[PDB]
Design an enzyme around this catalytic site. Sequence first.
Site, mmCIF file in Angstrom:
data_model
loop_
_atom_site.group_PDB
_atom_site.id
_atom_site.type_symbol
_atom_site.label_atom_id
_atom_site.label_comp_id
_atom_site.label_asym_id
_atom_site.label_seq_id
_atom_site.Cartn_x
_atom_site.Cartn_y
_atom_site.Cartn_z
ATOM 1 N N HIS A 134 0.817 -1.216 0.000
ATOM 2 C CA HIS A 134 0.000 0.000 0.000
ATOM 3 C C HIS A 134 0.851 1.266 0.000
ATOM 4 C CE1 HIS A 134 0.526 0.209 4.496
ATOM 5 N NE2 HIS A 134 0.368 1.502 4.277
ATOM 6 N N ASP A 149 -0.011 -7.491 1.917
ATOM 7 C CA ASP A 149 0.486 -6.118 1.818
ATOM 8 C C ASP A 149 2.024 -6.096 1.809
ATOM 9 O OD1 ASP A 149 0.003 -3.122 3.895
ATOM 10 O OD2 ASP A 149 0.476 -3.366 1.751
ATOM 11 N N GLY A 194 5.905 3.091 14.185
ATOM 12 C CA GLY A 194 6.210 2.374 12.957
ATOM 13 C C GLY A 194 5.716 3.094 11.716
ATOM 14 N N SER A 232 4.513 3.174 7.829
ATOM 15 C CA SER A 232 3.958 2.226 6.863
ATOM 16 C C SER A 232 5.106 1.479 6.182
ATOM 17 C CB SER A 232 3.113 2.951 5.798
ATOM 18 O OG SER A 232 1.754 3.178 6.201
ATOM 19 N N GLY A 233 5.005 0.154 6.124
ATOM 20 C CA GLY A 233 6.046 -0.668 5.549
ATOM 21 C C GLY A 233 7.247 -0.932 6.445
#
Lengths: 241, 241
Positions: A57, A102, A189, A191-192
């Site tokens: 995403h 994802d 955190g 994203s990713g």
Amino acid sequence: CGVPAIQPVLSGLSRIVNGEEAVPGSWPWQVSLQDKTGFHFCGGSLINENWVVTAAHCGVTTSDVVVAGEFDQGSSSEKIQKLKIAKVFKNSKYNSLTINNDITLLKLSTAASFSQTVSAVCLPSASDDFAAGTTCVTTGWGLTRYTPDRLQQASLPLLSNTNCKKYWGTKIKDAMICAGASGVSSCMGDSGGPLVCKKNGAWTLVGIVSWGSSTCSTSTPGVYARVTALVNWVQQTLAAN
Amino acid sequence: CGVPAIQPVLSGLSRIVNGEEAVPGSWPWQVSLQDKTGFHFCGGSLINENWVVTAAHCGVTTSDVVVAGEFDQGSSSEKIQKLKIAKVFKNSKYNSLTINNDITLLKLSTAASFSQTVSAVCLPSASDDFAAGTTCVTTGWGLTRYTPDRLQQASLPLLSNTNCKKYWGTKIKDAMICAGASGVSSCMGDSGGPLVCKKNGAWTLVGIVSWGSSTCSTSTPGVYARVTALVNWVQQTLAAN
């Protein structure tokens, strides 16, 4: 892999509120993904000198770049490596409505040069078991979405998928795993970014950040892509390319 | 473009709660995007026989497909056209953290066959003005994310970007436009679906769905990609390909 040349130090404050600051260079696989203008929008993890793993995403393209060896995003004084992306491999099973499966791999145009502050995280095997209640660690610059500019860390426990559904209901799928809701937020955190657990003296990648509480509540857990469910696709992609 | 062969009928109930059901076939540019398995994850709009416009955060690939001429997603009795995608053109300025410049074009492998129920929406010119307070219409199957399976419609007013920031703060950028907060929800719009306004007897695409209230509140407006800010990129892409 998984053995930092500079050892991490995690105290009691990593377990409450919004975590604590990391020892510089002690999470050497952590990278930052930036657009062509230098804007940080996601995180990721080095798995060897030629490959980085992140979330699908994030929507990364070959005009974005990988930054390795960073501690302070606001400093221009530390050594870093800016690495071009040759090709982007999105998992064909990703679904932008449910956000399941994802994961995306990035192949670098030229290899990173590994060192004391730049090296790889270990990948799990598809059959590894990371039990609910295990204390793991999430790292990143995620708090800067709402504030400290240096890399943060928090210690938080894995949950069972059934207990996670008491919080998120039918959003939770088999290729996801949850952590937190223990008195500490998951919002540091990116994203990713990585969720790592320490087994046999080596740190291993268990999750990739997918989404968290919209209010960074200390009693709502974060949701991650389950790396054990996706590592076979990772190794097939590396061997074919 | 913009003149349906089957005229829409919009009543007073399109203005309250969650809108009302559309007259079948009366929004003939509305398409559904489905994965290789047939799962609906986004919407979009036909702009000619070879091209569809949608949102970039939908993350469409050449293994997804476009479905035209649909009214009831639960019916197998109506005529529809399932069209393969030859190439995907994401706007290079899209940013997955801020969700700005949220537009992608899809080029079809073979042209759609236009008819009474399948035809194109009109595009605005870059300099068109759609004033705050104008009543426009959003259509889609978005309510099925939480329920009716037939295409719904709601009438709702455009807001100024300044008034929209009283709701969403620094999330609101210049390439966005907001509508609603008038006693009706925006949640019937699929991600990537149309927001159209009627000028000079023709319906014109003003917005593309980006995000809305997490609780579908009747007093929180939806946020859309501003098509006037992106139509020049659309026409350059069509001419070069």
